[PDB]
Amino acid sequence: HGELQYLGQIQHILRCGVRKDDRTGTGTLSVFGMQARYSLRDEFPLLTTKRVFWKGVLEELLWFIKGSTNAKELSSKGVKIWDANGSRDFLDSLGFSTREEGDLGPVYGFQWRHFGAEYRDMESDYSGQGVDQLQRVIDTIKTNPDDRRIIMCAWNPRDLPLMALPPCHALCQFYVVNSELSCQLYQRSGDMGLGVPFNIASYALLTYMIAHITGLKPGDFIHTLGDAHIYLNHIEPLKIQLQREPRPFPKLRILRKVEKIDDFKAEDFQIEGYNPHPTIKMEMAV
Amino acid sequence: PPHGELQYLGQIQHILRCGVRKDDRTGTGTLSVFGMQARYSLRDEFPLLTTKRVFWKGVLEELLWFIKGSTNAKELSSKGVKIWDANGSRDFLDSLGFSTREEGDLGPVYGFQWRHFGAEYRDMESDYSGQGVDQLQRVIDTIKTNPDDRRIIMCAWNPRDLPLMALPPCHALCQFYVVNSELSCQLYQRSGDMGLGVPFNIASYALLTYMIAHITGLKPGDFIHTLGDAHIYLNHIEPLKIQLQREPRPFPKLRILRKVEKIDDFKAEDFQIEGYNPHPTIKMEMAV
Ligand SMILES: Cc1ccc2nc(N)[nH]c(=O)c2c1Sc1ccncc1
Ligand SMILES: Cc1ccc2nc(N)[nH]c(=O)c2c1Sc1ccncc1
Ligand SMILES: O=c1ccn([C@H]2C[C@H](O)[C@@H](COP(=O)(O)O)O2)c(=O)[nH]1
Ligand SMILES: O=c1ccn([C@H]2C[C@H](O)[C@@H](COP(=O)(O)O)O2)c(=O)[nH]1
């Protein structure tokens, strides 16, 4: 079972991790550098030891793809994961006093579709400015699948001062061999309790989507971690989760033929056979 | 638990055993695996591989060249370090449409992205003083003032500058980490020529970690090497089979011979490698 690599990482950190203070003031147990491999072949790695917020995964990805940097746009679909980092108080603490609530700055959506464009605000029109990395990845996969440069990068040093949160998913790399598409994510910072399960699902989903558009089979998702950490108030909750036996991963079916990445809608996806254990409350450190 | 040269030899064995055939840009052909990670301790030793002699002069000189912000291959070539000459040659540059550039102008690669990320590239000899983001000095400053930061990153991958690069960076980014007065480094290498590139590259980022540790008053911890497309070129199979027959020897030490306050002030004569006793050099063709 693929899920055993996630649970193995949690237990590796519980026992070898080092105490480390953090930006949030909460404290963490932390390890630097880990890697896990999840198969996408006839299965989809949505964790079963706790229910992962699939609606959030799907809507957050559609939002990235659209190029949005407005947390209220996501919040109005019922997904509140970016609300704390886009709030008035949070934005004021970084010194963005005149920024509208929900304006996260030039984060993923903007960097993926408009890398290098000049950010103004979340409502501006950026059509045709900057580099559309997402569409370039798709185009390269179709014409030169052997390419070792199929990368999408959200980390933009010049824009960091304007971001409410510098991207945790600094970059991802695609790989093709034998008509099978794989993806590796470099995650610089991983909240192992709250974020990583959700982050795994997102990139697996992105890989299914791209595979669908390019006529390829999904292969592997490789998850690479920089600072992999467990917040101190997640230790007891993760201990509960580790008592649970994984159930089989579900499958993902895409329900119509879709030609452009921008045409996918929430209704085109169906998770089949997902039957997780209950959610576990893990407070978000902000 | 293996923390030295055996991880590297193990990756080689794994690609020879389970690697898939994959064609590549250079027309040589490879055996390839996607996604690998190894961890090299830097604690009282320096990971210069011993089953073949690694080109230490080239490692050192290339790192000093990156640090000073250069993207001119002639500056290495002038020192007898030829590792960038095929990608900086007149013919290679012209083959990519760069007929007006001077030979050796690799474009806005590491030196430029590390010291001036976001500046508008003109040519290799332009004055970029005060332009773009000095990522390297920022890394060093964050390490001194906020060692717990999970954002201590230097990124060479610049999508806007890609069309101008002779070769897009293989070392897309690196991340630093501090705990218990120890500095570690992780490298994301999108593409690793396991025979020729990877030993030399491990040594590069181990050396950068020692230099930064020295400037910040920290001890070197680990170097974590992460690979995207880890590949053995088909014409490196014979040389690698010879290498896998040889027993690893203890790693050397690295000594910094003087107290140096700024990263820019390091010179080649400040570094001494001690007790390096490798098996001979093995020649391996460079795929262009
Ligand atoms: C998107 C986001 C924004 C800020 C975050 N802050 C912390 N501390 N942890 C996080 O995982 C986190 C995340 S991912 C997340 C958050 C909530 N539910 C599932 C996944
Ligand atoms: C710097 C560089 C430039 C282009 C390259 N092309 C191939 N194919 N492999 C490589 O390792 C490579 C390298 S690293 C290298 C080259 C020669 N000696 C040791 C290390
Ligand atoms: O998709 C996401 C977004 C954020 N985080 C986490 C990691 C950190 O705990 C925190 C970000 O804080 P810094 O690393 O930037 O300090 O949120 C994730 O795990 N996944
Ligand atoms: O420091 C370096 C520079 C280049 N290469 C390799 C990897 C590839 O074999 C080749 C670059 O080719 P592409 O991945 O860009 O196609 O050189 C390395 O391994 N290390």
Side-chain angles (χ1 to χ4, degrees), chain A residues 30 32-33 37 173 175 186, chain B residues 32 35 39 150 175 177 188:
Chain A
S30 163
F32 189 60
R37 173 182 308 261
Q173 178 169 15
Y175 174 96
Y186 187 82
Chain B
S32 170
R39 181 180 300 261
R150 299 181 288 232
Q175 184 173 10
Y177 174 93
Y188 187 85

Side-chain angles (χ1 to χ4, degrees), chain B residues 48 53-65 75-83 200 203-204 207 268-269 273 276:
Chain B
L48 202 53
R53 179 181 308 282
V54 176
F55 187 27
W56 169 252
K57 185 186 162 197
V59 170
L60 180 52
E61 291 300 340
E62 181 196 55
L63 184 51
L64 298 173
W65 175 73
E75 288 172 10
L76 290 175
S77 195
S78 294
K79 294 167 136 54
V81 181
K82 311 293 203 205
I83 67 184
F200 182 102
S204 294
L207 174 59
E269 301 69 31
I273 286 289
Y276 187 47

Side-chain angles (χ1 to χ4, degrees), chain A residues 77-146:
Chain A
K77 307 272 169 31
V79 180
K80 314 302 191 188
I81 66 184
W82 285 109
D83 290 355
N85 291 109
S87 73
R88 180 76 277 130
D89 288 359
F90 188 74
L91 293 182
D92 287 346
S93 78
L94 311 173
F96 309 138
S97 316
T98 76
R99 206 183 272 193
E100 288 172 69
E101 206 167 34
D103 194 343
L104 300 171
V107 296
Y108 295 95
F110 183 82
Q111 298 298 339
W112 285 9
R113 313 310 306 266
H114 305 290
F115 190 101
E118 192 196 341
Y119 193 75
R120 290 143 199 279
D121 71 33
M122 69 191 172
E123 296 302 325
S124 326
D125 186 350
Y126 301 113
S127 323
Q129 306 177 36
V131 175
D132 186 344
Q133 293 187 79
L134 183 53
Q135 196 50 56
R136 292 192 170 256
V137 157
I138 291 158
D139 298 348
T140 304
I141 286 161
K142 285 171 183 192
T143 55
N144 187 16
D146 296 317

